[PDB]
Every structure is written in structure tokens, then in C-alpha cells.
Amino acid sequence: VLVQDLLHPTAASEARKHKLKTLVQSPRSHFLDVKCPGCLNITTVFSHAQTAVTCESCSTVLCTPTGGKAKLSEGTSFRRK
Amino acid sequence: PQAKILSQAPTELELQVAQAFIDLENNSPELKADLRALQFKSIREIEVAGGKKALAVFVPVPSLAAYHKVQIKLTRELEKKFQDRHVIFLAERRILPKPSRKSRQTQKRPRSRTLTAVHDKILEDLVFPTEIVGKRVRYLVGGNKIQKILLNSKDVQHIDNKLESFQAVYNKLTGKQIVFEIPS
Amino acid sequence: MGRMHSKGKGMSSSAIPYSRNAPAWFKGSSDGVVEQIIKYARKGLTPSQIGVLLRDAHGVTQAKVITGNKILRILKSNGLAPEIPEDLYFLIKKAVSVRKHLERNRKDKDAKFRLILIESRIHRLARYYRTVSVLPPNWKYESATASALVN
Amino acid sequence: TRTSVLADALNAINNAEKTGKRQVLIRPSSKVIIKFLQVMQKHGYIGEFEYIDDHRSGKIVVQLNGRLNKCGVISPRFNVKIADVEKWTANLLPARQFGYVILTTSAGIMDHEEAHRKHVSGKILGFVY
Amino acid sequence: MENDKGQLVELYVPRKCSATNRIIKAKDHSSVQINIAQVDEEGRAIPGEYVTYALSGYIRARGEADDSLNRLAQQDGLLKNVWSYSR
RNA sequence: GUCCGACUUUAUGUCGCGCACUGGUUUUCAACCGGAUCUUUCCUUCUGGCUAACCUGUACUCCUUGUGGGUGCAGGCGAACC
Ligand SMILES: [Zn+2]
């Protein structure tokens, strides 16, 4: 504490702290590639999406707005971007 | 077609580079169909420590998109043709001085033509295949400055030994020393 | 953590990523993105909803990263920027809503105070937009004329 | 509202020194803070600091060595004529043998002795000793 | 401190805290001076030869005396990786 | 170099205060201030003066065969100045 690095703190401590409070502030969110069982189109969605995102081919929602991040639908399969 | 791909007064060394560009143009399916619309702005040579050399091609810059699209392939083929000389695809940008309080009005100098912005763009384009993910500046006790650049661990394999040549190029261009570090 | 018109001290916000340039994984074209922005605006959408749509349904992190211009700037280049800026318009919408609620029931004093707060905020934002000449220098907010702008 | 950023920087330095630490994290990191800390380095009251680019006004990490005992800004940057420099040194510095009134002249931000050497004076920034 | 002739006039140069570089008051009745014995090849504490660290009363009262001693001993090659410079 | 304090009616040889005045001050030194220069690095620039000055080359070389040194006329350096 008396002597301590701030330029290179442990990455565990980096994930520990709040966003806007790291050395350089970087978002904790990320994007996802979701596939709906309907068609083979891959849709790029946001982790903390705010809208009932649907594939352009079919009127099926892939996410759901939530106080925090998106709650995906039942049978859609995603891969982190 | 040596002269067309270079919009500057001829120089014997750069003619060889243009000829190498023609030899690159010899291969059809990927090195053509985009490489025709190419130019130059007096490529220059920077000495590197240990006898190494860094050739720096100077794009006109309204077309850095095409050079960026082509750069990786052109770099490795040119290194194959050009031994011991590392090739760097730098931009050329007009650095303007400030209107001094006693000077006369010219026009609002856009910030993109300023020393700091131009140097940031030069250092960002000193290495295309990687991206700058952090910038640290340490002022030593003795009164000299160092500008650490933190680069992506991903895609570091392209720049394996070009780090020292990058340091030499930046030092020659500016005099502002620089140390490259890759975070874990 | 100021909360100009209340005692709040929050700092809930968004941290713009360090890298200004385009994300590596994005495959869309800047021209296509600008066309999408134009179409969304022609649908009758404010820039904020345009940014939300581009962030959710598509890989657009933010317009300035991909195109190089901001959403309102892109709209203004094509001449779709609304005559009243979006935040001020929403402030007038809220003010007219509270005034409607007041004139439909007099005794509610808390909403009267909230209307005072909203009108103060409207005056501040109007002063700012007037000193930048976005609005004409004769532009003012009046209680009777707010409905026409909202309607 | 952060009005005088240099005030926040020097206050953080003082707090992180009185508690005995060897490092400080100054958030806003303007030019004036950089020049102030550079003068302190030149005279040794500080160690080896560092600018952390944010694209967002940056930040600074300052290394100390306990040699300093107090920074401090004169928040109204009073116009200091070359005659009033001695007055400020008497009122602020603890002894004539050391201490430095860091003041901003038309020739840059300099310690009071250097400004008196150039025979130029301007506004006063702060004091270190 | 130094007379113009170059002769010292100070009564005594005070010790300084080996962890915070702050001087040790004459009546600082909380500060300590630790001695750590030098060790030869076969683990015999060589007598009369050691290394001294003057910890101030301030850090001791604060509660960081042991941490500072950990770091200070690690720097001079006494303890192996007991203290990490990055918390 | 200059020299003066211990040697006392005097000094130098001597004991050096480590030079009481004045220089080499590129002896490395170290600064403490400037000035000009190269950066894609401008300091308001011309328009005639005046061309001050030699990137002028016309007649040419005073003198050791030596660009040290010049008598000098159309281009042509303007911060040396109106
Ligand atoms: Zn489908």
C-alpha cells in the first residue's frame, strides 16, 4: 500500500474495479453473433441491448430489454465477438 | 511504367523500388486490380543500428486506404526482394506553424495539420498490421522524455524484429525517443 | 455527479473505448452505414434512436468510429437536422405534458414545482442553443406557444 | 466543478505525501501540471512521474521519494511584478536558503530564482519546498 | 548546515526513516531500528555483521511497518518473493 | 604576465595568501543568459531605393606557382537599412 504499482496493477484487480475507474477506462460490454433456429443469418447484437432485436428475415425476437444486459431467447445460439 | 507510379523528381534508388513494384504487378490475381493507382512522395532511407536500414515509402495520403488494404502482401514480397532493408509505409502530412501573436492571419489552422496530431498519425501508421492500444509517457529524472507504446498482443507476430527499426525511424523523424512494450 | 436540478450524485454513464478507429471485426461499409442513418432519419427518428438502432441490430459501435462524422453532423450534411434540437424538443414535450397535467388538476403542487424546474432547464438549454446560433435570436419558450411546437 | 485543476493535483500530492506514500494518481493532467511537476523534478522535490494517455485529458502517475514536504497553489494567479517576487518568497517560503515560488512567465513556467535570473516576471502559480 | 569555512555546525545529522525517507525526531518515542543478521554459507549467523533498517514511528502507528519491512528486506535480498510491487 | 603578505633601515633565492591588477579563457569542463541556423519548422511581405554585402563574371590579377588579397561593372542577398 505504501509502495505499490498503479501503472501495472493485476488484471484481477482490473476486472475488480468499476468501469470509468480503471487506468484507461474501457467498457465491460461486448458484442455477440446470434443465430436463430429459423434461418442461417448471423445477427450482430449488443450485450446490453435495449430493443427487441429481430432477424430481418423473420419476425422473431432474439433479445429482450432488461435493466442490465440482454436476456436472449430460448433457442438462439450465440458466440462472443 | 516506372515514372507513372512516382509523382516526384526521379532518384536512382527509388527507381529500383518502382521496378520492384512493377515486378509485384507481374502477379495477376491478387497484386493487380488495385495496385495500378499508386504513387510516391520521395521514399527515404533511415539508418538503423547494427548495419540495418529502413526504407520509408511516402504515400500522397488521399489514398492511404488502398495502401493499407495492400500493405501486408506488398511488405513481405518487398522484404523478399529487398534484403536487410525493412520497408515502412509512412504518410506525408503538412505540418503548419502557429500564427504568432505578431504574425499575420492566414486561415484557421485545422488541428489535423499540427505537430502533435501529425506525429500521432505517423506513429499509428508506423505499424499498420498491429494497432496502438495504449500510450504512456515517462519523464526521466534527468530531464528527458520517453513515449512508451503498448501494442496488441494479438497480431504481434507480424512485428517480430521491426520494433527496433520503428524506434530508429521515429527517432530520426522527430528526435523523441520511444520504447515499445507489449502487455501480457 | 452534479445533477444540476436535484440532490443526486450518480455517475452512471458509458465509457467510450480507447481505440478511435474501426473495430477489427466490423465488416460493414461506411457508405452503407451512412445510407442506413439517412433511411432511419427519413423514417422520422432522432439521432439518439438512430445510434441505439445501429448499436443493437447492427455492429455499429458508434458512427464517428465507423464513418468519421457524428450522427447529427451526418444528418446536417444531408439536410435532415430538425429545426429544434432533439434534447430541447424533448424538454418542451415534457413541459407541455406537465402543464397539461396541472391544468387538469390544480391542487398538485409537487408537479407545479417540477414544471418550474423543467422550465428553468428549458431556459438554460435555449440560451445555450441561442448563443451558438442554432436557434434564431428571437426564439423563446412561451407557455402558450409550446404546444404548437410539440404538436 | 473542478475549477483549478492544478489545485487538485497539488492537494493530491500533499495528501499522498503526508500519509507517507510514494505514488499519486492525478486525474486531469493538463499542461500546467506537467510543467509544475517538471520543475519539481528539476529541483528534486519529486521523483519519476508518468503521463497515461486516455484520449480523455490523460492522467498522471507521480512517484515520490519523501523529499518534498508541501506543494500548494496560489489559486488567484496574481500578477506579480518583478518587485513583488521577494514579497511572495518571504510570505510563502520558509527560508531564503531554499524553496521555490513556481510562477508562470511569458518565457514559460519557471521557479522564482530562474525568473529573477532571466529578469522576467509574470503571474504566480504555486510554491514548493 | 555548513559554515562558509566548510566546517559543520549542525549538532547532529538526524536519522531518516528507511521506508519513508522522513527524518527521525530526537524524542520520537515510537520509532524502531531493526537489525537483521547476515548469514554465511552454512547458516551460521556471523556475529557483529548485520543490516539495519530505521522504521519511523509514523508508519508503525499507521500499521504499515511490517509491509514496509517486507519490501525493504526483499529489495536487499533477504526474503524471496514475500512482497509484490503490484498489488 | 603582473606581482604582494613572513625578513626585520631593501629586495630577490626562499615561506604561498594558493595571484591583492590583467589574459590563454574551445583545458575537458560545468552552467546563466542570449543570437542564427536544419526540420513538411517563417520572423508580415513586397515595391522602388541602394544595392549595404559577393551566388554576379565582365577587363583582370596587386603579390610566393598559393581563393590570404584585391581595382570592378548588367544579372543578382534586401532585415545591413529606407
Ligand atoms: Zn429466421
Side-chain angles (χ1 to χ4, degrees):
Chain A
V1 165
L2 254 298
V3 158
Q4 142 189 22
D5 194 354
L6 312 93
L7 305 170
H8 322 93
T10 37
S13 88
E14 291 325 330
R16 274 280 330 290
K17 297 201 225 126
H18 183 222
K19 178 208 42 170
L20 310 150
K21 214 166 259 289
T22 317
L23 271 188
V24 86
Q25 52 155 6
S26 194
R28 306 298 189 63
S29 72
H30 55 277
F31 290 89
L32 316 155
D33 303 357
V34 288
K35 149 258 184 200
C36 187
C39 66
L40 275 197
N41 290 124
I42 283 298
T43 304
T44 326
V45 290
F46 191 37
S47 303
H48 305 68
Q50 279 150 339
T51 43
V53 179
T54 89
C55 181
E56 59 275 10
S57 300
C58 55
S59 81
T60 69
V61 317
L62 295 213
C63 305
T64 50
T66 292
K69 58 173 45 170
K71 154 182 151 283
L72 301 193
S73 304
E74 311 66 50
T76 82
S77 50
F78 78 88
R79 246 163 45 171
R80 176 158 166 174
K81 180 60 63 52
Chain B
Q2 191 286 135
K4 70 176 64 160
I5 68 183
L6 192 147
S7 298
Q8 194 87 79
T11 293
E12 52 274 90
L13 191 273
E14 76 199 342
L15 308 191
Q16 169 185 345
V17 189
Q19 293 276 93
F21 270 34
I22 317 304
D23 320 331
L24 259 283
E25 180 71 6
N26 267 6
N27 276 327
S28 178
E30 41 265 49
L31 306 162
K32 290 213 279 187
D34 35 19
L35 202 140
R36 294 72 51 90
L38 249 69
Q39 270 91 17
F40 275 121
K41 292 210 71 67
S42 162
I43 311 100
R44 77 170 295 203
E45 150 62 31
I46 296 312
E47 191 265 4
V48 195
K52 206 148 276 305
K53 286 177 267 307
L55 255 287
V57 313
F58 288 155
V59 188
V61 322
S63 75
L64 223 34
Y67 271 60
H68 271 330
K69 179 181 304 316
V70 163
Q71 189 161 341
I72 47 184
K73 315 297 202 91
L74 208 153
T75 326
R76 48 169 147 175
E77 270 65 20
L78 263 278
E79 179 60 38
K80 273 182 196 187
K81 313 156 96 83
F82 281 77
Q83 281 58 61
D84 158 54
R85 304 141 270 171
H86 297 273
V87 56
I88 304 194
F89 275 56
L90 285 209
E92 279 313 338
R93 291 188 161 98
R94 200 84 48 227
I95 290 185
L96 309 178
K98 306 73 161 183
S100 82
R101 305 218 147 109
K102 63 213 282 162
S103 183
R104 293 324 182 71
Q105 287 277 60
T106 88
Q107 258 202 137
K108 168 157 180 63
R109 181 181 79 167
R111 199 174 267 86
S112 47
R113 313 269 146 67
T114 63
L115 180 128
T116 60
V118 160
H119 276 98
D120 293 353
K121 282 302 183 67
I122 271 173
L123 187 48
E124 159 287 340
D125 268 349
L126 186 62
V127 47
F128 185 32
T130 82
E131 295 197 293
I132 303 177
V133 81
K135 205 169 304 203
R136 264 52 152 171
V137 175
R138 41 198 299 274
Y139 309 77
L140 291 193
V141 159
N144 41 1
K145 193 197 310 148
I146 304 157
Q147 200 175 150
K148 270 180 58 165
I149 318 304
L150 314 168
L151 290 90
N152 265 319
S153 197
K154 168 199 77 56
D155 206 318
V156 69
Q157 36 93 350
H158 288 56
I159 318 299
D160 71 346
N161 214 334
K162 299 218 167 213
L163 288 190
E164 176 125 0
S165 34
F166 291 171
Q167 302 184 330
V169 163
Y170 208 70
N171 196 339
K172 206 62 165 63
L173 259 291
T174 84
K176 303 148 58 53
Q177 328 170 21
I178 173 179
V179 174
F180 291 84
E181 301 250 30
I182 296 96
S184 313
Chain C
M1 55 302 296
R3 282 315 97 74
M4 146 177 71
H5 271 174
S6 55
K7 294 197 132 102
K9 297 289 197 264
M11 91 182 153
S12 71
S13 186
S14 56
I16 299 310
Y18 170 82
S19 169
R20 328 180 159 284
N21 59 56
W25 53 265
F26 183 60
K27 303 326 282 184
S29 39
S30 74
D31 321 329
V33 152
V34 173
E35 143 48 17
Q36 273 283 10
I37 294 175
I38 277 189
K39 181 166 69 145
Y40 278 133
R42 300 191 114 83
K43 278 172 172 186
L45 272 78
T46 193
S48 64
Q49 316 172 286
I50 287 187
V52 152
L53 262 292
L54 300 195
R55 199 206 41 227
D56 296 342
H58 322 286
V60 185
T61 72
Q62 31 183 85
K64 195 161 194 196
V65 157
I66 297 311
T67 77
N69 307 26
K70 287 179 194 297
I71 295 265
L72 187 130
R73 188 180 274 211
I74 278 177
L75 296 199
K76 206 164 159 217
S77 310
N78 314 128
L80 288 66
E83 80 289 9
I84 288 184
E86 77 303 7
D87 41 5
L88 199 140
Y89 165 62
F90 276 114
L91 281 187
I92 325 185
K93 192 187 101 153
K94 195 176 278 143
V96 78
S97 196
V98 194
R99 188 156 323 111
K100 185 156 83 55
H101 165 75
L102 251 54
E103 52 76 20
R104 209 141 38 76
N105 63 207
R106 317 274 320 133
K107 299 187 79 35
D108 169 330
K109 293 167 172 203
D110 182 74
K112 186 156 156 178
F113 172 72
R114 294 314 178 161
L115 182 134
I116 297 317
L117 273 185
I118 294 332
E119 247 154 31
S120 163
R121 203 167 321 143
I122 271 179
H123 292 327
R124 293 161 148 249
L125 206 69
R127 187 222 313 296
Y128 165 69
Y129 276 119
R130 208 179 317 130
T131 207
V132 184
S133 88
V134 187
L135 303 198
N138 96 323
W139 202 99
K140 58 202 52 182
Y141 168 105
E142 182 50 311
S143 308
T145 81
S147 63
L149 291 163
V150 165
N151 286 56
Chain D
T1 36
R2 329 184 52 111
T3 76
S4 159
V5 49
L6 184 56
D8 303 347
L10 293 202
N11 165 243
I13 297 280
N14 294 357
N15 290 351
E17 172 36 69
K18 275 185 234 159
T19 68
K21 311 193 157 21
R22 296 289 211 68
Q23 56 273 60
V24 202
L25 179 77
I26 302 155
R27 202 173 67 195
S29 73
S30 47
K31 312 202 181 253
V32 196
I33 294 166
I34 293 287
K35 310 300 301 283
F36 208 89
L37 307 181
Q38 265 191 60
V39 176
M40 266 146 65
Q41 251 178 24
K42 197 206 300 155
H43 289 182
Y45 296 121
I46 212 172
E48 173 72 14
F49 72 101
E50 173 92 43
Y51 176 95
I52 295 178
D53 182 14
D54 260 344
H55 287 160
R56 304 190 141 260
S57 306
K59 299 167 182 172
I60 294 169
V61 155
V62 161
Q63 285 255 345
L64 303 88
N65 73 356
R67 193 167 266 137
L68 185 147
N69 49 49
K70 201 187 178 80
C71 310
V73 298
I74 292 308
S75 96
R77 286 169 202 200
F78 293 135
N79 315 134
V80 175
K81 312 215 171 314
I82 209 182
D84 305 351
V85 161
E86 331 160 322
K87 285 212 161 203
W88 278 112
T89 60
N91 266 18
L92 292 213
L93 316 189
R96 315 161 31 83
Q97 284 73 50
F98 72 104
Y100 295 102
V101 167
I102 310 328
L103 55 84
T104 170
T105 37
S106 100
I109 294 170
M110 42 188 48
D111 71 81
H112 82 264
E113 304 219 338
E114 191 191 88
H116 163 274
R117 210 151 38 246
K118 322 277 204 64
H119 195 260
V120 86
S121 147
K123 314 204 221 203
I124 174 174
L125 271 188
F127 60 101
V128 300
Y129 57 98
Chain E
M1 168 190 50
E2 261 334 295
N3 154 16
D4 61 30
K5 316 293 212 181
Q7 303 144 340
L8 175 75
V9 300
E10 282 255 357
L11 298 195
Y12 75 101
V13 311
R15 294 171 316 151
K16 284 172 311 313
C17 162
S18 175
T20 51
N21 215 117
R22 174 130 41 72
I23 79 189
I24 287 288
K25 315 282 311 303
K27 290 283 152 119
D28 210 15
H29 274 140
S30 171
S31 73
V32 62
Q33 190 179 352
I34 304 287
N35 286 25
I36 283 135
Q38 294 253 40
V39 175
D40 64 349
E41 292 98 330
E42 57 292 40
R44 294 271 191 281
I46 186 72
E49 287 308 34
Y50 42 61
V51 55
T52 64
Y53 294 64
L55 262 75
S56 162
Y58 183 59
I59 52 180
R60 280 180 95 253
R62 284 221 71 71
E64 291 46 49
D66 73 327
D67 195 28
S68 279
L69 200 139
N70 271 345
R71 173 198 96 230
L72 272 192
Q74 189 160 313
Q75 257 155 33
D76 194 332
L78 296 296
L79 287 39
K80 259 70 74 201
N81 95 344
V82 78
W83 168 81
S84 76
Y85 174 110
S86 172
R87 285 291 218 80

